UniProtKB/Swiss-Prot annotation:
Protein task: Plays a role in signal transduction by regulating the intracellular concentration of cyclic nucleotides. Can hydrolyze both cAMP and cGMP, but has higher affinity for cAMP and is more efficient with cAMP as substrate. May play a critical role in regulating cAMP and cGMP levels in the striatum, a region of the brain that contributes to the control of movement and cognition.
Residues at which a divalent metal cation 2 binds: D119
Family, as annotated: Belongs to the cyclic nucleotide phosphodiesterase family.
Organism ancestry: Eukaryota, Metazoa, Chordata, Craniata, Vertebrata
Chain sites annotated for binding a divalent metal cation 1: H84, H118, D119, D229
Name of the protein in its database record: cAMP and cAMP-inhibited cGMP 3',5'-cyclic phosphodiesterase 10A
Shown part of the complete sequence: 715 to 1041 of 1055
Subunit and partners: Homodimer.
Domain notes: The tandem GAF domains bind cAMP, and regulate enzyme activity. The binding of cAMP stimulates enzyme activity.
Active site: H80
Annotated TM spans: none
Source organism per UniProt: Homo sapiens
Binding site for 3',5'-cyclic AMP: H80, Q281
Length: 330
């Protein structure tokens, strides 16, 4: 019920936060893992907004209120949580820093915010589940069900007193940024990714791809969102493997619910089918992750380290399948 709002203590605390100096260098890198720095996550987001967009892009009080309320509207689910949000935002920061002048000031601020917000109020259930069991959300949002909800949650947070970080934009730019954010969040529906990547691959290979063409821009931005959403697969192996544990924890909980409603879940969501996970990851990397980072690297050459890391992780899943895995901690 309702939108959660941070405390005075929470946002005033973030305002006074200072990022440890050693992390300034690390945060610029694609492979940076926020994992070991939980207390710093909101501060890391402020830092990234300030470096990409400028210290005066948003009023500081409103930005800190906005961030801490965003955190409060992520649920305590195993994967689609606050940590995922900040991780996705950091990948976007790294893509933007490496491609800075391709994107307008409006796009950069919109996208970093879009990434922080893109899974807002996720309940640990897939679009598949919501539509199968006719959740009210599936009635309201016929396609891209959770993503339309996440966007709606974003707008609800902006509408809280003192939270509207975009108010100082012209009426035209304000409309433009909300549209950038809407399209970006909707694009995190993996259903849409397959069509988008295919089209972009075609536009690229024929050389019709043109970033001055708004519809092309929207599609490139869409693939950036996919690349950021999936970036757990671009980290160092132990990080990728630990995150995969959280992804599956969520899946198995959904699968358990389906069994109670008389439907056998897909194997991926079946906790009694963990033997199939390594092959399932192989499938996911071959079908989704590798093609994504492949096309993204063609369009944005500086993103190549995402693709190299993804390939290294595919090799690791292959090693698992062959029985070559070494000691793992969880
Ligand atoms: C969405 C998804 C599904 C299966 N395996 C994954 N690694 C994954 N992912 O990366 O988010
Ligand atoms: Ni999502
Ligand atoms: Ni996500």
């Amino acid at each position: 019920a309702g939108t959660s709002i941070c405390t005075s203590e929470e946002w005033q605390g973030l305002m006074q936060f200072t990022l440890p100096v050693r992390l300034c260098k690390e945060i610029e890198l694609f492979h940076f893992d926020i994992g070991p720095f939980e207390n710093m996550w909101p501060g890391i987001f402020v830092y990234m907004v300030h470096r990409s967009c400028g210290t005066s892009c948003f009023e500081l009080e409103k930005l800190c209120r906005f961030i801490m309320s965003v955190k409060k509207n992520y649920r305590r689910v195993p994967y689609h949580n606050w940590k995922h949000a900040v991780t996705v935002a950091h990948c976007m920061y790294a893509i933007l820093q490496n491609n800075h002048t391709l994107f307008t000031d409006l796009e950069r601020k919109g996208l970093l915010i879009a990434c922080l917000c893109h899974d807002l109020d996720h309940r640990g259930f897939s679009n598949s589940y919501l539509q199968k069991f006719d959740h009210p959300l599936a009635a309201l949002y016929s396609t891209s069900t959770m993503e339309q909800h996440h966007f709606s949650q974003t707008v609800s947070i902006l509408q809280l007193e003192g939270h509207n970080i975009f108010s100082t934009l012209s009426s035209s730019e304000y409309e433009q940024v909300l549209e950038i954010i809407r399209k970006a969040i909707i694009a995190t529906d993996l259903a849409l990714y397959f069509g988008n990547r295919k089209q972009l691959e075609e536009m690229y290979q024929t050389g019709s791809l043109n970033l001055n063409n708004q519809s092309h821009r929207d599609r490139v931005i869409g693939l950036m969102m996919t690349a950021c959403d999936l970036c757990s697969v671009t980290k160092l192996w132990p990080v990728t493997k630990l995150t995969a544990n959280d992804i599956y924890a969520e899946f198995w909980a959904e699968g358990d619910e389906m069994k109670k409603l008389g439907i056998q879940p897909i194997p991926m969501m079946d906790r009694d089918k963990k033997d199939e996970v390594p092959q399932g990851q192989l499938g996911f990397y071959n079908a989704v992750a590798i093609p994504c980072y492949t096309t993204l690297t063609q369009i944005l050459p500086p993103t190549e380290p995402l693709l190299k890391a993804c390939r290294d992780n595919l090799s690791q899943w292959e090693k698992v399948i062959r029985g070559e895995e070494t000691a793992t901690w969880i």
